[model samples]
Each structure stands twice: as C-alpha cells, then as structure tokens.
Target: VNSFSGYLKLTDNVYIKNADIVEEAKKVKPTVVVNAANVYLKHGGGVAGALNKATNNAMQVESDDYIATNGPLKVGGSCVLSGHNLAKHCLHVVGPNVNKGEDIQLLKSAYENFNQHEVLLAPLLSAGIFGADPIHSLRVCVDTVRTNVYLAVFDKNLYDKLVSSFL
Candidate 1:
C-alpha cells in the first residue's frame, strides 16, 4: 500500500459517512477528518426529501477547529439556523437577504430560528438556494444578530437554552 497523508476536518458537531472510507482514510493515514455524516442524504424522498440534491454542488469541504466558526461568538448563515451548531456554541446563525446574496440571509435565518426558538431554519423555499459558506460568512451573520440583540428583539429563549447547554 502507499504511504499515508494528512487529513482535513470539515464542519463541527456532525460528519459524513463515506467521506473517509477505510481504504482511503488508511491510505492517507489521516490524522482526523470532519465531514457531514450526511444524515440528510438518508431522507430518501421523505418529507424533507432530498438534502444533498442531485443538482447541488457536491463539494464536501474539509472541516476542522481552524475552519469552524467559533461558537459563543454568535453565528449566522445563508440558509437557516444550522450555522449556530457550527462553532464553540454557535447561535444558529443565518445569512442575509438571499434575494440579494447569501451572506445577508445568514442573520435572517439564525435570527428567525432564535426568534422561533427552534432549529430547522426558515423554509428553504423562502430562504432559497444559497452558497454553503456559513462559517466564512459568519461575520455578516453576527452583525445582524448584534443588531437584533441591541433592539432587544432577539429571542432570549433559544439563547438561554443554548448558553446553558454548553457554551
């Protein structure tokens, strides 16, 4: 067999299955890797139906401590509240106006979920297609969160629960 190489971690809290096949991972002697562990793919035409849609970009980015969006630092995303779970204790951040771009949708999504005190994020149809750089787009999301916090309109229920849980 060939020598092993290093590894890359992608995403936090969760991972993908086949991302690191026994033969492949062992081949590179990957230290440790992070992947989607795509439970979303198992949806198999369920209510949520397809998660990793066929037309969607198949880019399984590498994740790790460095790549992850720090938790407790506040979070946002382009799609929905999923970003909150990204870092140390992400506040389920979402990005800005998808109508305009994905970054803005980040806050709108997290804020929406926080307000709702729920995960699952806003309706994808309403949120619409977005780039999956939720971590990189963290700042754009934090600004919106900070704004809402200042207004005292932020959902403290979810915030409180999230803080006490870990962060």
Candidate 2:
C-alpha cells in the first residue's frame, strides 16, 4: 500500500503532508475526503479530477445527480456524497474566487464546514485555480478546521512554504 512520508504535525491531530491527496485518502480512510469543488461540482482538474478518476467517474455522476436535485452550491457551501475506493464520504465545498474579489471569510467558512466531520482529508482549498494566496489559505485552513485533519499538498513549492511557515 502507498504511504505518506515526512508529514509535519500542525496540532495533536492535524498534519500536513507533501503527498498525493488521493493516495493519502486511500491510506488513511478518513471519515471523509474533501474536494475543493466548484459550485457546479464538476470534477475537471486538480484534486477534484484526481479523486473523480480514483472513483472511476462515479463521483461525477453523483455530483451531477446532486446538482440536479439541489441547485448549484454557493461559495463556502458544502454537501456530503458517497465515496468509493477512498473514504466512506466525500465533502464537496466551494471556495471563494479571489479573481472575483472574494475575501478570506468565504475561504474560512469553507474550512469551518469541515468541522462537522470527525476525520478529514483535504487539500489547500482555493489555493489552486481559485487563486487564493497559498500562505493565507494555509493559515485559514489550520485555524478553522476543528476536527482531525490531514492536509495533502501536491505542489512542492507550496509544500516547502507551508513546512517553513509551520515548522
């Protein structure tokens, strides 16, 4: 089985790893794996795409069904969906778009939504295509998530930055 390595402890139960989010999810089997999703819940690229592929595209169908039932999810809003080949559940949450002048509160709210889960595995929300400053995103993530969390970082530069800032 694939395993995580060189993780930095953020708190007693929170950790940051320079690893693949999908692999970490498969390994840890957390209560839920978080997707830094768009409002439409389209799993196109980045962490979302990786996870969608891991589940053999069933996630996308589930997301489509969700959107069909409930309208597009608003920023900072989330919904729990069944997980496959990973955790038991997947929490899809939309973050603010910095390009649209959205502020950190939305990003914080996104992290706050994760509090409902006991064990969470997630990436740096809004730090990717959504364009939130990675440092600020990392800070909000560490500050807001109240439950046990494993933050998987894919970019080496961002991983180094997080490691330096936290360590």
Candidate 3:
C-alpha cells in the first residue's frame, strides 16, 4: 500500500491510491461503490460511462431497470442497483455539474446521503466529466464522510499530489 492513506479531521476518513478503481473495487470488495450517474440513471459519461462500456453496459441495464418505477434519481439522491462487475452493489448518485465553489455543499450532501455500509469505494465525486477539480472534490469528500471511503486515482502523480496536500 502507498502512503496515500490519511485522516479527515481524525474521524471522517479519506484515502487515495494509484490503482484502477475497478481493480480496487475487487480487492476491497466494498458493499457499495458510487456510480456518480445522472438523473436518468444513464451511465453514458465520465468514469461511470467508461465503466459502463467496460462492463458491457451491465450498469446501464441495472439503472434502466430502476427507472421502471421510482423514476429519475436526482443529484444527491441515490438509486441502489445490483453490482455488475467488481462491486458488490452500486449506488447511482448524480454529481454536481458546476465548479467546486458553487456545488461543494451539494457534493457534500451527496456523500452524506449515501446509505452506510462497512466499506464503500468512490471516485472524486464530480471531478471528471462534471468538471470539478479532483483536489477540491476530495477535500469535500474527506470532510463529509464518516465511513471508510477509499478514493481511486489512476494517476500516480495525482495520488502523490493528494497525499502531499494532506501533509
């Protein structure tokens, strides 16, 4: 393990590492991993989009199935789905579409709203196609989460940068 693990205010947790999120998902086997999907529950973009393609749209199928009744799950709201690939369960939650400063509170609420589980893995919520800064998103995630949250970073440089920021 890298020195990418640290605390968020001594109680709330935060973690970062250079590894594929999907691979890490398999390793830790978190009960639920966040999807960061849109209201439509479509996994058509961002990390969710890529994973949807990689998993042959298994996630999309699950999401589409959810739409059969309860309807669109808004930003900060979540839709639970059976795990497709590495994850044991999927929490489809929409991330903010704006900058960190504008949507930081919304981002925090999304993290807070997730159903508690033993171990949960997530990305830097809203950091990808949503256009929020990874560092900023991490800051909010760390501060808001009280559960064990492992954040996956594909870039070693960014992981190192995040670790250094905590120091």
Candidate 4:
C-alpha cells in the first residue's frame, strides 16, 4: 500500500477456518505463525487456547523452560520457539489485556518483531478477549509491519466481518 519496498502480503483471502487449526495449519504450511501468549507463556486463552490444544500443549511445556522470568511478557514483547506443528516456528507475542486506553504501539512492536519470518499467520492482536476492535488492530498490524502477514480467524462471523473491512 506504499512506495516502500517490502514483501508484506496482507492478503484478502485469509479466512480459511473450515477445519481444525492443525488441519488448517497443514494446508497453510507457513514457516512461522503467531500466538498471543501470556507472560507465563501459556497459550491458554483466545486463539492461543485453540492453538495450544492443537499442539497438545507441547509449546506450553517448551515455553515454561525458557520464559520462567518473573513478569508477563511485556506488551509487544515476544519469544520464538521451534517446537510446533505445520508451522516450523512459533512467535509468541504478548498482547494487551485491557480493552481501551491500551498502548497500541506494543501491538505494532509485536508485529514488527515477527517480520523476521517469511510467512506469518496472525490473529487480530488484542481483540476478542482483550476487548479491542479487530479492525483497528488489523490496521495497526498492516501499517506497522512491512512483511507478509496473513490474518487467521477461527470464528466464522468474525471472518466475515474482517473480510468486509478489506472489501
């Protein structure tokens, strides 16, 4: 969307939620994917919850070893892990907790950090349980990161809503 030269492929055809995440991951075959992890590195909430279950808590066990630090992964802070399914790597980004008055900058930072990977599947960070608007978060992601990023949504109605925004 700019003269800036980057291979950021923010595609409109990102709604592929017909099957389980593992099945979908198999089809997507991305080199890396995004997970909104809590400070303790548990993928126990929101889309991360689904992904955590899909991976059989393998990442949960792995994260505990590395992310044993005291506090939550700072908003926008992230950790990368190699143990995962279709995605060879996983980028766990800490999303905001509050709905409003949250620093959207952290979300941008998270997406920027994830730009190192070739193909990435991201959720609308800070949306859903975090109570932020998905469209606004999506815009921040697209505007902040200059790399190929695909939006992955599990809910059918949410997918439709996101698709409409692009249209």
lDDT of each: 0.26, 0.84, 0.70, 0.66
lDDT of 2 at 71: 84
Q: On residues 7-124, what C-alpha lDDT tens digit does candidate 4 reach at each position?
A: 2234542322323445556666667777877667867777678777787888777777776654457777887886377587888887776654567667777667766775576677
- Please say which candidate is ahead in TM-score: 1 or 4: 4
**Pairs of colliding residues, candidate 4:** 8-147, 39-72, 39-73
User: Judged by lDDT relative to the true structure, which candidate is superior, 2 or 3?
Assistant: 2
Which candidate model has the greater lDDT, 1 or 2?
2
- Model 2 residue runs over 4 Å out of place are 1-6
Tens digits of per-residue lDDT, candidate 3, 1-167, equal 32223322323456566667776666656678777777787777677886677678787887777798778876776767877776778877777777433455678778775536546777777776787777887777777777677677767788777777763
Tell how far residue 26 is off in model 3, in angstroms.
Answer: 3.5
Higher-lDDT candidate among 1 and 3? 3
* Clashes by residue pair, model 3: none
| Residues 1-167, model 2: lDDT tens digits | 12435678878667888888888888777768899898999999888899999999999999999999998998998999987778889999888978767766889889889899877788988988788888888888778887877788898888988888773
Write down the TM-score of every candidate.
Answer: 0.20, 0.91, 0.82, 0.79
lDDT, model 4, position 148: 62
The TM-score between candidate 3 and the true structure equals 0.82
On the 0 to 100 scale, the lDDT of residue 24 in model 1 is 36
lDDT of 1 by residue, 5-83 (tens): 2321112311111221223322333222111121122212211122222213222121123235432222342112222
- Give the backbone clash total of model 2: 0
